[PDB]
Write a protein that binds this DNA or RNA. Structure first.
Ligand SMILES: [Zn+2]
Lengths: 138, 122, 99, 208, 151
RNA sequence: GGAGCAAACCGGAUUAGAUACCCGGGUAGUCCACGCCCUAAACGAUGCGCGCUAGGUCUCUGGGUCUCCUGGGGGCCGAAGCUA
RNA sequence: UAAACUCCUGAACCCGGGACGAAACCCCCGAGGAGGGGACUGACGGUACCGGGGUAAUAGCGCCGGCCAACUCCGUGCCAGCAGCCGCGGUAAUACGGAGGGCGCGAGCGUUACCCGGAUUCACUGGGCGUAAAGGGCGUGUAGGCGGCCUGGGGCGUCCCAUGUGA
């Protein structure tokens, strides 16, 4: 039945990266867009686009990686180090502005859900509005 | 377990129990002896010890190690239990207190006198 | 202000009284989860108008009896036998617990 | 109270010149000068690789002796620092340097800091015109530290102030030997101090 | 020409009819105290000749650390399978608070102010290695906005 | 209901002893109906449902003009990763 | 440098001075009001404090094998005894007991008791369950828990500002 559409995506992504795939699809969502639209605005991916699969709405996620490395295992450093889900479907989590978390000391983003809209972290204290913490990314 | 299991069943609390039934959780309990007797110690070691059973205020009765060289505890001599286990001796989780009551201090000792109720010489 | 809760009647088997059940979801004070809890109140229905299945708004009122400290304010929507079951279904379960 | 018992036998233990000795430690013997090794029946014997606790401990004890202060007081003035915002390393020493007995030594009023103590604890020393014989008094910025009128002509001070003539002392202290008056310009930074101590170990040892 | 401090020199014993011959474990650290660090682990029947090998393996395996005004560039947790390590940035005058083991690592890193702890297992040899994979994964801001650029 | 097998049970040998191993015999049982029993190394010692993450090869099975792809099921080998 | 020895300082004590805390009720003018005025009252206490004079003037306690820092001699010989854990003692003990010395701390130092900590060892932050303790013997299913893509209203949760309370 697919329990949490939102964590599946971050996993589609996560997994898609460890094998260094140029692209990976994830079923459409006017919300899921509000997530990717951010991960790209913050350069974790080259962006995306809505594609057509067997007559079904999907979202291709074009991945990004560092350069090939020097020495043992030319594995390129991951552009998406971390992408864990914080607010889960079994355990919802909502934060007030006066306590929004800071992902890995400033270098990390905490994409969350608020009334004003779907926003990052600094962009959440910009508009000084809290909401449901979707997930942390670095 | 799922957080929902936690809402329901919830995390279980330890609840520790005392290795010293001294009553009132009291740091010391007066008691008179009933019999002072030497007892040999446990597995890895051997040496006829000096111990005694002490009937307590609370109608109790316990065995407590008498530490130090030589003692003057007979039968009806009262003493102060200090509570403390001796590994050498199975089933003795109490110490007689020296320099207190009918249990005098130590004869001639100079090092660590406080740990044995021994007055500083002149 | 006089406290008010939305709820659902689940017994008009009493003379001019009713058994109003109201759920109250709230964030657990340790595990975040929004856990619903429920309480039963008894409302003073002088006109014997409020029947079973009724969803009502009750108001903190001057005591009417031992456990009647609330009067029903106004109806919400009649036919609601669906929810009423949920409660009476849990009832039958207690039987299959003892021994 | 103070360490009373021999104090130039720590001079050795540390291996760091502790001028808790007046004219002595300068002269051809802070004792240490003659015997640069640890006290005891051993001491002069192949040293043993100190443990982390050790090095930290030892660096931590080295400090307390120099200021000849109670460990109660010492620690309780450390916490005081930890609380206030700022770097705890330097700030710690600042409080220390605001000791009335210290300001005395550091200004030069008394030859040793062991003497800077008694001379205060004998009412010899006043602040802002008013007598203060409590060795702990926390010197605030601006306070004029000086001697009384009952000491203006006393053998000792007149042989220290004699030996205080112009010779600069303390980048945060104005000293007027002519009238025997001294002032505490400001709290001291770090660079103004240079005790043979690592303030970055002490902070560590106090985590156990 | 750098700096040296060994964390431990154990006495591993093996079996062979009649008796039991031994080698040794030598874990060491090297670091100029300004951004370069090197842990090493060598072995040899000789106790000195051990740390002397460990020292060479040291200068070999190296790692620049993105020191930030004397501290870490950002906190990190790193699981070396068996043992867990936690590193945090700290304001000035905080000190090196850590197990004695990861301490050496950081005190040789040039680190001066840090917050850390060791979760789960606490085997020296592994903790060490973790701490090493820890630093080899620190990311200063530039190193970040460079990747997330790729222009 | 009872041919075969077979705890227990007796006998032969073995053994210092042999209530055991081995052998000859042997009853409940093993089988049927009906009821009760509800245990287990009830073991993949791996709860279930769903999405994701290279392939190679053997087999069972269903569809497709088929030295090949496409579903399902049983094995082995191994990408990444996981693991004490 | 510890000691004696030299010099200076002068806790203790002595004499002298000596409070803050205490201005209102009271009273006159005014009017018994406002306001102005005038008068008494201190247990602590002859205390704090100040001035003078002024004598070198108690040190104690725990430990010293590892954790955990501080080692040697001597006695004892699985005895006497130490012990919080691992353990030490059966002629060579830095672990028993004196001493030398030393580490810590100081009018305290130890000990016992109990509390949190370490214990990330009940785990929300933060653990797990193929063999280490741990998958229910296996199914069906009640309550519960969780739930796909889209447009809209409501706005409970959620978020936010103001405000009352949070003595
Ligand atoms: Zn000296």
């Amino acid at each position: 039945m697919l329990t949490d559409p939102i964590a599946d995506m971050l996993t589609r992504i996560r997994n898609a990266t460890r094998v260094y795939k140029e692209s990976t699809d994830v079923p459409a969502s006017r919300f899921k867009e509000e997530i990717l639209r951010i991960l790209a605005r913050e350069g974790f991916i080259k962006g995306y686009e809505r594609v057509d699969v067997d007559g079904k709405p999907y979202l291709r996620v074009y991945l990004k990686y560092g350069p090939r490395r020097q020495g043992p295992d030319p594995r390129p450093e991951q552009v998406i180090h971390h992408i864990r889900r914080i607010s889960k479907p079994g355990r919802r989590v909502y934060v007030g502005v006066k306590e929004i978390p800071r992902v890995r000391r400033g270098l990390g983003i905490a994409i969350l859900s608020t009334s004003k809209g779907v926003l990052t972290d600094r962009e959440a204290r910009k508009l000084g509005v809290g909401g449901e913490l979707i997930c942390e990314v670095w | 377990p799922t957080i929902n299991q936690l809402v329901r069943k919830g995390r279980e609390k330890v609840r520790k129990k005392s290795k010293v039934p001294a009553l009132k959780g009291a740091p010391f309990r007066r008691g008179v002896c009933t019999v002072v007797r030497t007892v040999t110690p446990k597995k890895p070691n051997s040496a006829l010890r000096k111990v005694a059973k002490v009937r307590l205020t609370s109608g109790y009765e316990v065995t407590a190690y008498i530490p130090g060289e030589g003692h003057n505890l007979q039968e009806h001599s009262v003493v102060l239990i200090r509570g403390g286990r001796v590994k050498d001796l199975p089933g003795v989780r109490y110490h007689i207190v020296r320099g207190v009551y009918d249990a005098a201090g130590v004869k001639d000792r100079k090092k660590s006198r406080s740990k044995y109720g021994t007055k500083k010489p002149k | 202000p006089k406290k008010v809760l939305t709820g659902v009647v689940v017994s008009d088997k009493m003379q001019k009284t009713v058994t109003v059940l109201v759920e109250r979801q709230f964030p657990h004070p340790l595990y975040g989860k929004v856990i619903k809890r429920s309480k039963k109140y008894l409302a003073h229905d002088p006109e014997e108008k409020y029947k079973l299945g009724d969803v009502v708004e009750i108001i903190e009122s001057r005591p009417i009896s031992k456990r009647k400290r609330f009067r029903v304010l106004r109806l919400v929507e009649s036919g609601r036998m669906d929810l009423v079951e949920k409660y009476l279904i849990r009832r039958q379960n207690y039987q299959s617990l003892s021994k | 109270g103070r360490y009373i018992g021999p104090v130039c036998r720590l001079c050795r233990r540390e291996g760091v010149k502790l001028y808790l000795k007046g004219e002595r430690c300068y002269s051809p013997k802070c004792a240490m000068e003659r015997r640069p090794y640890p006290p005891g029946q051993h001491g002069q014997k192949r040293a043993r690789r100190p443990s982390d606790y050790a090095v930290r401990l030892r660096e931590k004890q080295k400090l307390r002796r120099i200021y000849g202060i109670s460990e109660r007081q010492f620690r309780n003035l450390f916490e005081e620092a930890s609380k206030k915002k700022g770097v705890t390393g330097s700030v710690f020493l600042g409080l220390l340097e605001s000791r009335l007995d210290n300001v005395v030594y550091r200004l030069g009023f008394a030859v040793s800091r062991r003497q800077a103590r008694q001379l205060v604890r004998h009412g010899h020393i006043t602040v802002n015109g008013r007598r203060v014989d409590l060795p702990s008094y926390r010197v605030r910025p601006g306070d004029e530290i000086a001697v009384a009128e009952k000491s203006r002509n006393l053998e000792l001070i007149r042989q220290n102030l004699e030996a205080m003539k112009g010779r600069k002392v303390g980048p945060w202290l104005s000293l007027d030997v002519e009238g025997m008056k001294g002032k505490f310009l400001r709290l001291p930074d770090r660079e103004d101090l240079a005790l043979p101590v690592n303030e970055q170990l002490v902070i560590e040892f106090y985590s156990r | 020409d750098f700096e040296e401090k060994m964390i431990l020199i154990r006495r591993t014993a093996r079996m062979q009819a009649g008796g039991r011959r031994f080698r040794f474990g030598a874990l060491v650290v090297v670091g100029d105290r300004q951004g370069r660090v090197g842990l090493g682990f060598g072995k040899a029947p000789e106790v000195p000749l051990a740390v002397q090998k460990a020292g060479y393996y040291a200068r070999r395996n190296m790692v620049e650390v993105p020191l930030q005004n004397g501290t870490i560039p950002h906190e990190i947790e790193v699981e070396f399978g068996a043992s867990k390590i936690v590193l945090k940035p700290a304001a000035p005058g905080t000190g090196v608070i850590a197990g004695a083991v990861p301490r050496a690592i950081l005190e040789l890193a040039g680190v001066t102010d840090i917050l850390t702890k060791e979760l789960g297992s606490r085997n020296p040899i592994n903790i060490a290695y973790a701490t090493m994979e820890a630093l080899r994964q620190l990311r200063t801001k530039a190193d970040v906005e460079r990747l997330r650029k790729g222009e």
